[PDB]
């Protein structure tokens, strides 16, 4: 009856992390996996992400945000790291299982 699709859209704008102008992945806390994930990132996307974070920080540090225009739109959010991160995880889970 109620689209998870319809919902995610909610949460996304609700989380409003796009008001700072940074993709979902630009937020995921940096744990062992993510670090390795991000450390596998192509230098392109890396510097991209960096700036997005520094900009985010700079905003946040000013208490002000990004013009309604520059927010990133849900459908246009680029899961730039999810793919690497996943391999990572399974890579690990593969290892963790083998060491038993």
């Amino acid at each position: 009856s109620r689209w998870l699709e319809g919902i995610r859209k909610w949460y996304y704008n609700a989380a409003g992390f796009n008001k700072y102008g940074l993709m979902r992945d630009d937020t995921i806390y940096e744990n062992d996996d993510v670090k390795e994930a991000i450390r596998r990132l192509p230098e392109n996307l890396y510097d991209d992400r960096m700036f997005r974070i520094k900009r985010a920080l700079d905003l946040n540090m000013r208490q002000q945000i990004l013009p309604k225009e520059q927010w990133t739109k849900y459908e246009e959010d680029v899961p730039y790291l999810e793919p690497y991160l996943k391999e990572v995880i399974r890579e690990r889970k593969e290892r963790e299982e083998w060491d038993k």
Binding site: T27, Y29, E30, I53, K54, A56, L57, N60
Partner: peptide, 11 residues
């Protein structure tokens, strides 16, 4: 820490 909860080395 920092309020955003994302690396801050950037700043």
């Amino acid at each position: 820490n920092n309020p955003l909860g994302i690396s801050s080395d950037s700043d």
